[PDB]
Design an enzyme around this catalytic site. Sequence first.
Site, mmCIF file in Angstrom:
data_model
loop_
_atom_site.group_PDB
_atom_site.id
_atom_site.type_symbol
_atom_site.label_atom_id
_atom_site.label_comp_id
_atom_site.label_asym_id
_atom_site.label_seq_id
_atom_site.Cartn_x
_atom_site.Cartn_y
_atom_site.Cartn_z
ATOM 1 N N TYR B 7 43.212 -22.960 8.378
ATOM 2 C CA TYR B 7 42.422 -24.072 8.868
ATOM 3 C C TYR B 7 41.427 -23.508 9.871
ATOM 4 O O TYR B 7 41.835 -22.866 10.830
ATOM 5 C CB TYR B 7 43.346 -25.116 9.516
ATOM 6 C CG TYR B 7 42.637 -26.317 10.120
ATOM 7 C CD1 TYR B 7 42.174 -26.307 11.431
ATOM 8 C CD2 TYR B 7 42.465 -27.485 9.388
ATOM 9 C CE1 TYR B 7 41.534 -27.409 11.973
ATOM 10 C CE2 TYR B 7 41.848 -28.599 9.938
ATOM 11 C CZ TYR B 7 41.370 -28.563 11.228
ATOM 12 O OH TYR B 7 40.758 -29.687 11.711
ATOM 13 N N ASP B 72 41.908 -33.679 8.294
ATOM 14 C CA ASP B 72 42.063 -32.516 9.151
ATOM 15 C C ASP B 72 43.540 -32.197 9.365
ATOM 16 O O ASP B 72 43.953 -31.048 9.227
ATOM 17 C CB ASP B 72 41.366 -32.715 10.474
ATOM 18 C CG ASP B 72 39.851 -32.619 10.429
ATOM 19 O OD1 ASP B 72 39.262 -32.582 9.308
ATOM 20 O OD2 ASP B 72 39.276 -32.578 11.525
ATOM 21 N N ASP B 92 37.283 -27.027 23.813
ATOM 22 C CA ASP B 92 37.119 -28.245 23.032
ATOM 23 C C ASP B 92 38.427 -29.020 22.934
ATOM 24 O O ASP B 92 39.457 -28.506 22.487
ATOM 25 C CB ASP B 92 36.601 -27.947 21.641
ATOM 26 C CG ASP B 92 36.314 -29.177 20.798
ATOM 27 O OD1 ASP B 92 35.291 -29.843 21.054
ATOM 28 O OD2 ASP B 92 37.111 -29.441 19.884
ATOM 29 N N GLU B 98 44.451 -30.104 17.795
ATOM 30 C CA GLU B 98 44.784 -29.457 16.538
ATOM 31 C C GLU B 98 45.717 -28.268 16.744
ATOM 32 O O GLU B 98 46.582 -28.018 15.906
ATOM 33 C CB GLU B 98 43.511 -28.940 15.880
ATOM 34 C CG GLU B 98 42.609 -30.043 15.346
ATOM 35 C CD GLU B 98 41.194 -29.578 15.050
ATOM 36 O OE1 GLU B 98 40.738 -28.445 15.403
ATOM 37 O OE2 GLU B 98 40.559 -30.425 14.414
HETATM 38 N N1 LIG Z 1 33.771 -35.455 14.147
HETATM 39 C C1 LIG Z 1 34.807 -34.580 14.256
HETATM 40 C C2 LIG Z 1 35.337 -34.163 15.507
HETATM 41 C C3 LIG Z 1 36.345 -33.255 15.517
HETATM 42 N N2 LIG Z 1 36.889 -32.714 14.385
HETATM 43 C C4 LIG Z 1 38.010 -31.644 14.402
HETATM 44 C C5 LIG Z 1 37.714 -30.279 13.728
HETATM 45 C C6 LIG Z 1 37.479 -29.217 14.810
HETATM 46 O O1 LIG Z 1 38.283 -28.021 14.865
HETATM 47 C C7 LIG Z 1 37.721 -30.001 16.097
HETATM 48 C C8 LIG Z 1 36.391 -30.224 16.804
HETATM 49 O O2 LIG Z 1 36.405 -30.913 18.050
HETATM 50 O O3 LIG Z 1 38.362 -31.246 15.714
HETATM 51 C C9 LIG Z 1 36.389 -33.185 13.163
HETATM 52 O O4 LIG Z 1 36.867 -32.731 12.102
HETATM 53 N N3 LIG Z 1 35.348 -34.076 13.139
#
Ligand SMILES: Nc1ccn([C@H]2C[C@H](O)[C@@H](CO)O2)c(=O)n1
Lengths: 157, 157, 157, 157, 157, 157
Positions: B7, B72, B92, B98
């Site tokens: 991932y 995700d 972040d 995650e």
């Molecule tokens: N609009 C978003 C915000 C976050 N994330 C997920 C994937 C990244 O690793 C992390 C980013 O903040 O969280 C995502 O998929 N889509």
Amino acid sequence: MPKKTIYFGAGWFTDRQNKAYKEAMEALKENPTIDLENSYVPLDNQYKGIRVDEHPEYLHDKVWATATYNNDLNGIKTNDIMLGVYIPDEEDVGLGMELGYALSQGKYVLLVIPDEDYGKPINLMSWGVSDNVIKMSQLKDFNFNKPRFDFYEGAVY
Amino acid sequence: MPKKTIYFGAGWFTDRQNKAYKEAMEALKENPTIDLENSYVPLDNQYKGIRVDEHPEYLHDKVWATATYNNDLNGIKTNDIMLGVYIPDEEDVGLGMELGYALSQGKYVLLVIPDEDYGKPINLMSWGVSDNVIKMSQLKDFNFNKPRFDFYEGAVY
Amino acid sequence: MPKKTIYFGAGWFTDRQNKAYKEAMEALKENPTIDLENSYVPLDNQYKGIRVDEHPEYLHDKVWATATYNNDLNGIKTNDIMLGVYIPDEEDVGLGMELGYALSQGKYVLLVIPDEDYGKPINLMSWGVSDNVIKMSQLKDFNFNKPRFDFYEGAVY
Amino acid sequence: MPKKTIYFGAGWFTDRQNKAYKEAMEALKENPTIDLENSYVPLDNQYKGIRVDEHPEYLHDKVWATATYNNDLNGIKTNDIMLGVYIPDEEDVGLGMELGYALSQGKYVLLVIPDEDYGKPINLMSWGVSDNVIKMSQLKDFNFNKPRFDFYEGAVY
Amino acid sequence: MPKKTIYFGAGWFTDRQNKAYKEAMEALKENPTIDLENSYVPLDNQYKGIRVDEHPEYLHDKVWATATYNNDLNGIKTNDIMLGVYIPDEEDVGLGMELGYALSQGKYVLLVIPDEDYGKPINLMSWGVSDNVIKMSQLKDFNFNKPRFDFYEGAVY
Amino acid sequence: MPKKTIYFGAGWFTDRQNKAYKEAMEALKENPTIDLENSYVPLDNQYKGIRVDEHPEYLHDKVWATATYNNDLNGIKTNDIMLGVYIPDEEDVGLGMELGYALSQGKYVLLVIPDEDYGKPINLMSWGVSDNVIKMSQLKDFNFNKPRFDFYEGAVY
Ligand SMILES: Nc1ccn([C@H]2C[C@H](O)[C@@H](CO)O2)c(=O)n1
Ligand SMILES: Nc1ccn([C@H]2C[C@H](O)[C@@H](CO)O2)c(=O)n1
Ligand SMILES: Nc1ccn([C@H]2C[C@H](O)[C@@H](CO)O2)c(=O)n1
Ligand SMILES: Brc1ccnc2[nH]cnc12
Ligand SMILES: Brc1ccnc2[nH]cnc12
Ligand SMILES: Brc1ccnc2[nH]cnc12
Ligand SMILES: *[C@@H]1C[C@H](O)[C@@H](CO)O1
Ligand SMILES: *[C@@H]1C[C@H](O)[C@@H](CO)O1
Ligand SMILES: *[C@@H]1C[C@H](O)[C@@H](CO)O1
């Protein structure tokens, strides 16, 4: 009333963080479904009494870091509820991690956002981990015996 | 000859984030223990193709958010390894969450930091969730078949 | 060329169940991302070969039940993917339980519904546990190396 | 006495279901080890007050379904004990799923069967998920402070 | 032709332990469903190469302990199968813990007992955590692609 | 004070075990943060009242073993805290397993060592699973409402 304990998930690194921290702590003191005394407050559970501010050499000590990390995880896992004081403009990676751990430990995950910021965009993953997100002004009266799922009334990026 | 999937955990919200993202993706293409084709890249798995940056009408759609969040989590849980592209100065919250989910799902949690930043302090909880942390220039040669626990050669805060 | 194993979740207690079962098994034989030989089929893994339908003396044997229950959980936990052959009008409590276990074990949870029934309402909790739901005629071509979250194109109750 | 909370896992779709529901709720009201007020009753926790019966268009709304599914999961995870009102002739896929989730969340899983049906065959996976299965007439006096493992005194298919 | 990796759970603290260890390792080398090269052997993964037997100065180093403990957990969680080399008369607390962790991580848990000891009583909790238990002479031919639940042909205490 | 329940993890197979058992039970009776009545004591929860000592044929009965194993797991999972009475010279595989299960269930894991033995070496995995390890003389006054992470002040092999 029955009372529940919490983990006080809140940054202490900015003015907005410290303001929201003070407010959230005050709201918890007034909430009759919360046992604040037996809740876990990171900042009062500093390993061995040592003050990371007065002795910043301990930020290279792996034992200090191990014990402090584990204390926080332990504080989450042994209490009823996960509380995340959350500043949309100052989002915190550490809190994010703790939210994920709380989810994994089967805890209700409540975010609290200052009223002045409620509605501002928050990370999708924050939106998703949370079981609910409320404004600071709702915290004193939140019924922790009947926590429910709801969506943030606000933006998510 | 055995290959693992990952991932691709990474922010895409700053110039340093995007630089590190591009670098990490190139490293993965060259790594012979990685099956990148069968790996999950969030940015290419957003519900319906939409990115809240390119189509801001979906910034309040709860269906888009539900599906993207869930996709995700699914991308983490069905792949072998959790990768976190990590900027110490621009941490972040989403990635933090995650990381915590990956931990809960029994995944090897590898942070990668740009060589120019490797050694800078990282959040304690990031330090702790991680099983290991390496520099960008190590990613192409990292043996994902024999992942081991190691400590960051760098500070925490 | 990479292949995944599955747990064959399916009732075998009605004519529609048995029809869908036979169809799903044939689809899996033709799917090139599935290793069916190393997959777990409950009906062929009952303790000692016995089926409470073919040998009803084991309907009160707690050893048979213990071993068969445990073997199924083991079949879910040691395979890559959870499959649920699913008849909307003849939903199965056993499969329901197994869906919940699969979720807990971090497995992709795929429901397959006969084409003639695809779209009919399904239990909310089935809708929710599932990562995705497809029609029988899609199963032979489903790419199990790149499983994604999607919503049922159909009702719940 | 100390008191525990429960999730009221019970179908409401048939005459036998509604009968057992009413009986189980009455038994819980009389049980002094149960805090029924702070327990989670699905049917009284309908998302946003909307009545799926008076407005069945909401069974195509994915937000309604998301929130309701999540409320139920939340009701299981934030309460002490999982209660499954279980009709052997009317086995419920939704309950089955919830039982699997309850197991995953570390809850005591208690099935309750109407006295008139206690002994009739139940699904193996129901038999196995359960930590115990009792008759409706035992529910009012069940000691939820000392829940123990036992086997169903009845058949399993 | 498909191969699984293992965690080599085994004490190394007695002559019978070391004998069984050597035997089990030889069996694994000959087993064609095992990728031994990509498997985790604790004794070769101790932090910094050090063994508290060969360098007893690390018997109070908390960094060594933290890293070694974490590496073992990581070795369990990132490999397909949990192996426990098991001497009924010389049971090991460390392995016991690792069996429980393996269970929690959804791993097939296989005990192997020297042929000369197979049948001797084993701790109930070892009997229970295990998915199966075999004799040393079965290990070279065990099909790790189709692992099933079975009961020890032997006593517990 | 609020009170927490425990699982009494303690061997009963040697003189030192039985001594520590008696001492630990006495300390718990005197500790005001513990509800001992509603805690799970294995030795008083023998399946069906049958005495494994007076009828040792039940050590070949798989139903007896299934029910007893499951009762213990249930006793761990339905109580607040995991207590391990731990003898460094008589380390117990069964306890080890239970410690691993307790970790997996999100419980505070407290080891208690007789004062005469506190400091003697313990298995790394015991050291690591534990959230804290204290001496018998500290048990009566341990505040179970505020359990914290700490390291054993002693050796580990
Ligand atoms: N609009 C978003 C915000 C976050 N994330 C997920 C994937 C990244 O690793 C992390 C980013 O903040 O969280 C995502 O998929 N889509
Ligand atoms: N006798 C039974 C009953 C149920 N099941 C499992 C496998 C199926 O997917 C589901 C059927 O109800 O549960 C089983 O293996 N054996
Ligand atoms: N010094 C130690 C002690 C224990 N163990 C782990 C690996 C073995 O399977 C088990 C041995 O007790 O626990 C370890 O890795 N190192
Ligand atoms: Br210092 C410190 C203490 C506890 N938690 C933290 N998270 C990031 N820094 C932290
Ligand atoms: Br409507 C409804 C509400 C809650 N749970 C459910 N399970 C199946 N339908 C349900
Ligand atoms: Br007899 C018995 C009862 C409970 N737990 C045990 N562990 C090992 N033997 C046991
Ligand atoms: C854990 C404690 C606090 O809530 C955050 C700070 O980053 O990490
Ligand atoms: C969850 C609520 C109720 O117990 C069942 C109905 O199918 O699903
Ligand atoms: C579980 C009960 C007791 O604590 C141990 C004995 O080996 O197993």
